[PDB]
């Protein structure tokens, strides 16, 4: 019924690539980065307008 | 099988076929060290960036 089989004295390993996740570490922190200077230019172009 | 009185069973071991066969183990130890340092340092680059 599609189910697997046992083997005796092995034991299944997290199934977590090590590698991927400092490449995916660089992109995350880069978006957020840029979501950042998105925050701060509005916040910038709001301060300068109620300058007036 | 029938028997013999007096005598023994060897060891049924030649040093002729484990010497080589022993050196070829050796190399295909030293082999896969290889492998474990080639992967060390491919790891090693990618967390130090």
Redesign the interface.
């Known amino acids: 019924n599609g189910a697997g089989l046992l083997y005796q004295g092995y034991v299944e390993t997290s199934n977590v690539n090590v590698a991927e996740e400092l490449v995916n570490m660089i992109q995350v922190q880069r978006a957020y980065e840029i979501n950042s200077k998105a925050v701060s230019t509005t916040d910038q172009m709001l301060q300068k307008l109620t300058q007036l | 099988g029938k028997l013999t009185n007096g005598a023994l069973e060897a060891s049924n071991v030649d040093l002729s076929k484990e010497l080589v066969n022993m050196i070829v183990a050796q190399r295909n130890y030293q082999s896969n060290a290889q492998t474990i340092k080639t992967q060390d340092q491919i790891?090693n680059t990618?967390?130090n960036?």
């Open positions: 790891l990618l967390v960036l």
